[PDB]
Design an enzyme around this catalytic site. Structure first.
Site, PDB file in Angstrom:
ATOM      1  N   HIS A 146       0.848  -1.157   0.000  1.00 34.10           N
ATOM      2  CA  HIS A 146       0.000   0.000   0.000  1.00 34.10           C
ATOM      3  C   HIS A 146       0.918   1.253   0.000  1.00 34.10           C
ATOM      4  CE1 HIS A 146      -3.291   2.738   0.598  1.00 34.10           C
ATOM      5  NE2 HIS A 146      -4.176   1.755   0.620  1.00 34.10           N
ATOM      6  N   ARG A 162      14.101  -6.882  -5.863  1.00 35.95           N
ATOM      7  CA  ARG A 162      14.361  -5.881  -6.850  1.00 35.95           C
ATOM      8  C   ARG A 162      15.454  -4.874  -6.429  1.00 35.95           C
ATOM      9  NH1 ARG A 162      10.484  -1.352  -9.748  1.00 35.95           N
ATOM     10  NH2 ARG A 162      10.219  -0.659  -7.620  1.00 35.95           N
ATOM     11  N   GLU A 178      12.338   0.845 -18.281  1.00 34.86           N
ATOM     12  CA  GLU A 178      11.492   1.925 -17.843  1.00 34.86           C
ATOM     13  C   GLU A 178      11.272   3.086 -18.826  1.00 34.86           C
ATOM     14  OE1 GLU A 178      12.007   3.079 -13.755  1.00 34.86           O
ATOM     15  OE2 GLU A 178      12.803   1.126 -13.250  1.00 34.86           O
ATOM     16  N   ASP A 184       5.982   3.977 -14.650  1.00 32.41           N
ATOM     17  CA  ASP A 184       7.386   4.365 -14.930  1.00 32.41           C
ATOM     18  C   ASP A 184       7.579   5.011 -16.336  1.00 32.41           C
ATOM     19  OD1 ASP A 184       8.177   3.266 -12.426  1.00 32.41           O
ATOM     20  OD2 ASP A 184       8.621   1.341 -13.261  1.00 32.41           O
ATOM     21  N   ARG A 187       2.926  -1.864 -12.066  1.00 35.39           N
ATOM     22  CA  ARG A 187       1.778  -1.076 -11.776  1.00 35.39           C
ATOM     23  C   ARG A 187       1.398  -0.031 -12.866  1.00 35.39           C
ATOM     24  NH1 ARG A 187       0.507   2.270  -7.599  1.00 35.39           N
ATOM     25  NH2 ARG A 187      -0.185   3.667  -9.307  1.00 35.39           N
ATOM     26  N   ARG A 203      10.494   9.211  -8.053  1.00 35.27           N
ATOM     27  CA  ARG A 203       9.883   7.902  -8.317  1.00 35.27           C
ATOM     28  C   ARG A 203       8.430   7.998  -8.772  1.00 35.27           C
ATOM     29  NH1 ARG A 203      13.048   3.848  -7.021  1.00 35.27           N
ATOM     30  NH2 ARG A 203      11.159   2.556  -7.087  1.00 35.27           N
TER      31      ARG A 203
END
Lengths: 927, 927
Positions: free
Chosen positions: A165, A443, A553, A590, A628, A748
């Site tokens: 979350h 990761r 990315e 990303d 995501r 980010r």
């Protein structure tokens, strides 16, 4: 009382109320009971203040008169810190109640009986195909045999990877209170309820609402990553643990209904859960090797504890005395070597007699499960354990074996029917969750591996890996991948980052391989990035190296990915290592931060096509791991069509997708939704490999390519080239404040999306679509029709627009205007205005392309849920805006009202955190 | 399939089917699924044989053609031992299914909205007053204030004493299967069931039916008394443990609805459960002191285990961080003295932090509950324990205290509402079940105490207690009750019986007093009998002597009871000892064996009146403990009116009644019935003390007295004076066979009732009513009307007739005729015929007095349930009759059919035990 609250709520959402539409009723009943509670706990005055905030906000959501926002602002900025906190708590809590009510409405909403057959039906939970209807379309419409459908499903894998979350991991205790509120609510609407049951359920509902509201400690410290992982695992106990075998049993029923007369094999690995919690350390140095070790042991502890905590029930049922030879022999073995004395268990505490043979077998499984659990617990708390290997399970096969023995014995004695009850459920739980109910991905970013290798090369005296070209890096890596001596000597100099990265490999070498999944490389750009991780794993002599998965990315990285993959697949060492399989990760959010969401979406469609083709050519099976921010991370029905929209052959029997932390509650909190989530993943995955969407027309590709160049240019000129964008972003959003708890490029993706979601503006999702649309339509008027045909006919395009449209429905540019006025300096206010003008224009082009007068006229049930939440969220937006002002400007003051709340040193930052969590719980997923 | 089975079943029971009447449907669905199972397990041929037995029996129950019985007999006597066993198992299992279905129908049968107000409404569960309606009648019709009603209920006690199933203690495992069959069944009839849920529930129903059927080991050994007690305690887990607080919460609601604004205090001792299992050794030398010690420790083990097994749930909920000083201080105490390391529990295995203060308090309670449980377990298995007193709970107050502390703290912090959830439920469970969820009564017969005292007197050299008159016994007992030296020296000679009786007192002196209830004296006749037990308890220096309770059994003993009680109450030593309270036990079935049931009923009414008056005069509060066989032991609605029928002031705030083992399943197996059982006990007890039934008219007493003289004379001339009654009884019933697994007078009441229940003849219940009725009607034609007025108007008379009428509805004199023909020698067959003639005549007088054309025309729902069971029972009666023949006559043989069943050395006695258990499960309670 209730009727008047129903009245206000109903005005907010006109619609065509049949018997199954109870959502407004639910929300009224919950708000009513919560208001009584507030009056009780905090006094009538405070209750009235909450009511007043709600009223003003609901009025503002009606006509969007800026005046109503100002009044709401005047009221909220006049409150002291104590009263502010109560009001933010109140409105946060109402959002959670509204979400629970919505979950209940979705669970009981009626299915449409006759589905039109259009792909669009798969976007909506009332119309989507369930697993049997999916089987029947494949048989009847695609001419597959039942046997071909059965055989594909048996070889299929769906893997769901749970991520944290981003703002508020909900603790187990509160989750359970939320579940009981939801239940009291459902039972209040049960047919034929006696008045006393109703009175009692009512008082139970009141009590649970209050218990949840008063679970509200503001704990000084951030949650440790171990606590965040444990919080993040709560859904297995609440629903998933039981949900899996309920869904697999529905598969058995569906198979039966298409003429397959066997059950879905209990050990086919159809469903797998994984996790990034304590595994992802990208940009996060709090994720240490110790954290990773602890979350592996925790996962092992919980898994064995869940089997242990249900084995006594199975023992009770398995009272049967008829068994086959094989099990008779094993039972008499165990019985002879059996302890004469008390076991400190709830149920079978004396020695189990040999005329209860299944209980003897299962009694031994219980002791092993118990020891397996205790070992993990001592390893966590004491740092080691004297519990030996043969007292526990170290591999899943050891656990399956006695269960399979029970199964065969029942079948051989004529009791197949009984075997297919709880025993079958238990077998399936073992086969799905194994000994670690989630496998953990690691990761870390490519540059950290470069740095580690550079420290090695320089200590060896051979130069600097970092200074080497891509060709030289490849060459040296392949030489050392077959090297005859280790790379790392005891005096290798190590900075803390380098040590931290090497020690992670050490944990990987020490822990069992069933704890781990993939090693994901953030910011991957090249072949050598992947070989770098392969070499570190080889250096640590890891017996089962994790598969190495690049995450490309930026747009430029996506464009270089195909040559990178081609070069990997050309290298004998690597081909041999991967054994016919490769996983690659894409990150929608990303890529969208780099280039705008429109261009990222289209580029990701193309890059997936290109990688799929390259894999085929090299005879490698490819899995695409969805990170995501994509249409596939929405949850609910929209996920179903999203999955079906994938480019052809990109699933091919193996789905791997991120279940985002802010979606987990909707996907898995209520048991019906949990079932329907598992179902649409399994059904869509199955369908897609046998029924790909239409590939796009050449005219459509070309227009997409043209639109992307323009979208990217607009996105990048605002976000990267406007020299004051960064300054405007820091004032207009709570980005800086979120961060304390190299520009946007080094920001980010989650803080980027989250900061703009907080202001209800959502720039990261829509920016660039406007220029794309306008330019396309103005270049040639015919393009409007081409775009509308794409929306109607091309599933990718349809889902990509729908997600943006949902985000517009959660948007309110009036909030951003209030923030500009309160927070942004005067000289930047025109910039903020011009962004709002782009929002409006972009929304209107989208509406025109979708053929809608209003937002979400496609999906009125979704629009209804969003609208019901809006007043609560709006109150929190305003509270937040004035809070940020106070925090940023120690000389901003207003006359404060005398303290309103009763009872019977929290600050501004506490109020802020409450608003941020509540707003994020009301917004759920966007980009 | 189903429809055709529905058709056959429906013919058996005409009636007026509305929507809530599903009983025939339920039975059809269960029989249908069970037949598929039989076909599966045992082959089509066997299935067809079962079906054929059922058909013949159902036809015989239609027209009662003796021919159908003969065919059924021909079929069943042709089966080999293997096939016999399968058929008896099948029909037994169908009875259990039918009972579960009936329980579901009773649970969901609609309540009548407008009750006529007549007392007769309280005999029927659809019409009886619930607790609120009871409160309202007392307020509105008897002019009590709400406060007076509240205050009486607070001081009220209801004690339910569980006695052993006379034939078949049902094991926990099977009970749970029965519960799941019942649930699958209910859920199959849920409104709006999806077809897949229906398909799955169906397959689940099939599976559970089969699992139950295959839980069928024929275990060589009788069940040990420890195993019988544990089996007998299963209902607490299944329903009572949760049912108590659900009912007490309904009391809170009802109080609220009559204007009392507080909850029923959590510690008022309104409901208490007790047990005779391992305490009653009357005529049972297998009940040893060791058995008694073990069932005390078992009860303690289970009680602490039930609290322990729900404390983690309460800990999870009690996450709140706001607490008062008192609890804050206690929590920090416990936290400081807290173990740094792993506790091997499912949930809170690490140290509990002090910001979770309620969890700290409850964590300590859990450790104590755990140690309390383990101590008991080591004491049972190892014979002692090193676990010390301060590690466990030795008194209930120690457990209540921290819970009360949690409660006050929540109340003081504004969370009263939350405290009244699970915490309140838990407090009530503690207050009701204490540390031993049943208190154990000891029972032993008066002559055993005489024998012990005789051994003492003679060893002392002072003569023989047995030779002493009643006056001398009293005198010597009172002298020794104040004696200055112990009676028993180390060389007292002791036979095994004497030792066994003394050692029981030793166990009473050693175990905690909260394990025990009353010391019941079987066959009590005199003052000295009671003083004898008092002296033995004093000799063993028992710190809290058990209250001594005489059981006056024969009619002559009942007639001498008043002078015996008067003499006790006159003695200062005794008055001082009992402290204003006395309990006396009556045994309906005992008294009825001596004098016939009619005369026992009337004499027990009179003796209760007389003892109540004598108690008042001496200022003693009297409790009458109802033994088995009375209208109050029926269960269901009839118990409600039975309680209200008690002579005035015989309840007076304290009810103590036997829940007979053969009634426990109906009273407590299904949760709604469990709730309604607790409710009618509490409501009736309350009502009666404020609303006694009418006292009888003098003409009615006189006629009752006259009828009793005649009833007794008829009963006694058949049962005791006919020199061949005993011989006829041994042939016509399975009495002798039951006994191997001084005439009738020395036969115990349960075998007497049970033997005649087995043949469907029920002589012990009705014999004597016939002569009474006939003589009364023939002496004066007006008596028919007087008797009808008594039936309509006098609750005692009404309930006494209704119980006999129910027993007639379970009777079938055709079964007894078949037994006469198969089992009885020719020269006794006229005797058996004349008994059947008396049955018929007696039934017809009863019908005439009740104003009924047919049996149970009052109560068609009860008649329906009995009729649906009849064919199953009848098949078992026939199987049994021919089995007894084979067992008694080793030269009786018939041509045997080739073996019918498949699979894929049990004998005749095994088949017999199966028939006896199944018949008793179908008959449930009679006399």
């Amino acid at each position: 009382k209730l009727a008047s609250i129903d009245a206000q709520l109903r005005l907010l959402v006109p619609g065509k109320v049949s018997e199954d539409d109870k959502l407004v009723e639910y929300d009224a009943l919950l708000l009513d009971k919560f208001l009584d509670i507030l009056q009780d706990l905090h006094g009538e005055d405070l209750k009235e203040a909450v009511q007043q905030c709600y009223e003003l906000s609901a009025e503002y959501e009606g006509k969007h008169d800026p005046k109503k926002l100002e009044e709401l602002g005047s009221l909220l900025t006049s409150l002291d810190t104590g009263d502010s906190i109560v009001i933010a708590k109140a409105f946060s809590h109402m959002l959670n109640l509204a979400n629970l009510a919505e979950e209940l409405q979705i669970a009981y909403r009626r299915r449409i009986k006759l589905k039109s057959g259009d792909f669009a039906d798969e976007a909506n939970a009332t119309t989507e195909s369930d697993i049997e209807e999916t089987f029947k379309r494949l048989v009847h419409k695609l001419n597959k045999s039942p046997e071909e459908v059965f055989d594909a499903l048996k070889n299929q894998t769906v893997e769901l990877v749970l991520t944290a979350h981003p703002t508020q991991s909900v603790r187990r205790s509160l989750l359970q209170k939320h579940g009981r509120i939801r239940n009291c609510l459902a039972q209040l609407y049960a047919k034929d309820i006696t008045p006393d049951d109703k009175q009692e359920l009512d008082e139970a509902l009141h009590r649970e609402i209050q218990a949840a509201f008063r679970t509200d400690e503001i704990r000084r410290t951030p949650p440790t990553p171990q606590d965040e992982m444990r919080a993040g695992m709560s859904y297995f106990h609440e629903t998933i643990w039981k949900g899996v075998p309920k869904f697999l049993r529905r598969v058995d029923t569906a198979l039966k209904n298409i003429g397959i007369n066997e059950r879905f094999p209990y050990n086919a690995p159809l469903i797998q859960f994984s996790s990034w919690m304590g595994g992802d350390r990208d940009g996060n140095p709090r994720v240490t090797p110790e954290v990773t070790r602890d979350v592996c042991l925790l996962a092992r502890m919980m898994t064995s504890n869940m089997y242990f905590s249900q084995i006594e029930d199975l023992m009770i049922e398995m009272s049967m005395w008829r068994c086959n030879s094989e099990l008779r022999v094993r039972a008499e073995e165990l019985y002879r070597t059996a302890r004469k004395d008390v076991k400190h268990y709830i149920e079978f505490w004396k020695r189990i007699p040999p005329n209860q043979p299944y209980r003897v077998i299962l009694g031994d499984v219980r002791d092993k499960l118990y020891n397996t659990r205790e070992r993990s617990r001592h390893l966590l708390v004491d740092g080691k354990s004297d519990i030996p290997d043969e007292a526990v399970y170290t591999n899943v096969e050891q656990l399956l074996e006695p269960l399979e023995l029970c199964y065969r014995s029942l079948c051989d004695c004529g009791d197949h029917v009984i075997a297919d009850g709880s025993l079958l459920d238990f077998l399936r739980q073992v086969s799905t969750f194994g000994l670690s109910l989630v496998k953990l991905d690691i990761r870390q970013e490519s540059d950290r591996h470069t740095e580690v290798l550079d420290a090695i090369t320089q200590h060896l005296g051979i130069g600097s890996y970092r200074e080497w070209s891509e060709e030289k890096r490849q060459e040296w890596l392949l030489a050392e991948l077959s090297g005859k001596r280790p790379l790392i000597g005891p005096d290798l100099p190590k900075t803390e980052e380098v040590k931290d990265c090497l020690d992670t490999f050490k944990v990987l070498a020490e822990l069992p391989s069933d704890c781990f999944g993939a090693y994901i490389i953030s910011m991957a750009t090249s072949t050598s990035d992947v070989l770098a991780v392969e070499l570190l794993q080889r250096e640590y002599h890891i017996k089962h190296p994790l598969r190495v998965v690049p995450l490309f990315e930026k747009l430029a990285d996506l464009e270089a990915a195909p040559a990178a993959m081609t070069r990997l697949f050309s290298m004998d060492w690597y081909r041999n290592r991967i054994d016919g399989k490769q996983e690659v990760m894409i990150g929608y959010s990303d890529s969208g931060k780099d280039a705008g969401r429109f261009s990222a979406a289209w580029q990701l469609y193309k890059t997936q096509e290109q990688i799929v083709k390259i894999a085929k050519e090299f005879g490698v099976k490819l899995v695409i791991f969805h990170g995501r921010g994509g249409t596939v991370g929405r949850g609910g029905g929209p996920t179903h069509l999203a999955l079906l929209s994938q480019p052809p052959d990109t699933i091919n029997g193996s789905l791997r997708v991120t279940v985002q932390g802010e979606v987990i509650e909707q996907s898995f909190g209520e048991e019906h939704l949990c079932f329907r989530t598992l179902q649409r993943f399994c059904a869509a995955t199955l369908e897609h490999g046998m029924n790909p969407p239409i590939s796009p027309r050449p005219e459509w590709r070309e227009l997409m390519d043209q639109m992307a160049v323009v979208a990217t240019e607009e996105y990048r000129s605002v976000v990267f080239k406007e020299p004051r964008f960064v300054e405007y972003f820091r004032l207009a959003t709570p980005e800086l404040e979120f961060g304390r708890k190299g520009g946007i490029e080094s920001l980010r993706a989650i803080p980027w999306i989250f900061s703009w979601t907080q202001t209800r503006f959502h720039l990261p999702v829509w920016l660039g679509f406007g220029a794309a649309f306008k330019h396309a339509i103005q270049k040639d008027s015919k393009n409007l029709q081409m775009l509308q045909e794409m929306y109607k006919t091309w599933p990718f395009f349809r889902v990509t627009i729908d997600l943006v449209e949902m985000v517009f429905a959660k948007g309110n540019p009036g909030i951003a205007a209030l923030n500009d006025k309160l927070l942004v300096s005067e000289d930047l206010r025109p910039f903020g205005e011009s962004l709002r003008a782009n929002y409006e224009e972009t929304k209107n082009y989208l509406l025109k392309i979708a053929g809608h007068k209003d937002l979400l006229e496609g999906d009125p049930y979704l629009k209804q849920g969003i609208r019901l939440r809006d007043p609560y969220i709006t109150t929190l937006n305003v509270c937040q805006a004035y809070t940020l002002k106070r925090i940023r400007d120690p000389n901003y003051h207003v006359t404060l009202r005398p303290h309103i709340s009763k009872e019977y040193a929290p600050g501004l930052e506490d109020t802020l955190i409450l608003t941020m969590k509540g707003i994020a719980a009301g917004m759920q997923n966007t980009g």
